[PDB]
Amino acid sequence: MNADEWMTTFRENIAQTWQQPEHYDLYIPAITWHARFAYDKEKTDRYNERPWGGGFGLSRWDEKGNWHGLYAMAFKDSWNKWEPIAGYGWESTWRPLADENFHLGLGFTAGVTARDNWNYIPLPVLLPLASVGYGPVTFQMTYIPGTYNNGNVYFAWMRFQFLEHHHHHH
């Protein structure tokens, strides 16, 4: 409200956002497309309940118009099993004129699925993704090309930008 009070208030938010980069991102299931489109009647005769997982990760920017893409999440199976995922690649995000928060672009990230075993050891995988959103609304897109019918699916998940998300105390 005051003169110096209004300054320190803004300077604190702008200085903390520029001094403390890298934000804690988190994603979760929302809506996905189907490629098979077949009448599932083999392993779905009755209503089945499957567990879910938590999505997380961070991102970076390069002065050379580069967008670092890093993923970090873990899924739980019905028979107890944590599946750690880690992405690493580059993405090209375009910025508007007047606006700034609103970003739209695409890229390629390689996710690595770890697994404890003497055969199913952690192996990397190539999967193209995209980033489109604005403010607290982040849209995560991911397609899987192939041939024509079995290679043209799209994925959609929710994404939120938070910090720490573990504890404050202060």
UniProtKB/Swiss-Prot annotation:
UniProt-annotated catalytic positions: 34, 77, 78
Q: Coiled-coil region(s) at which residues?
A: none
Q: What is its main location?
A: membrane
Q: What is the effect of changing residue 34 to N?
A: Drastically reduces palmitoyltransferase activity while leaving expression and membrane insertion intact
The impact of changing residue 89 to M is:
Mutants with longer amino-acid side chains at position 113 preferentially transfers laurate chain (12:0)
Q: Which family does it belong to?
A: Belongs to the lipid A palmitoyltransferase family.
Top-tier EC class: transferase
Q: What is this protein called?
A: Lipid A palmitoyltransferase PagP
The note filed under miscellaneous reads: Overproduction leads to camphor resistance and chromosome condensation.
Q: Where is this site: Role in the phospholipid gating?
A: 148
Listed InterPro entries: LipidA_acyl_PagP, OMP/PagP_b-brl
- Keywords, ordered alphabetically: Acyltransferase, Cell outer membrane, Membrane, Signal, Transferase
User: In which domain of life is the source organism classified?
Assistant: Bacteria
Q: Which organism is it from?
A: Escherichia coli (strain K12)
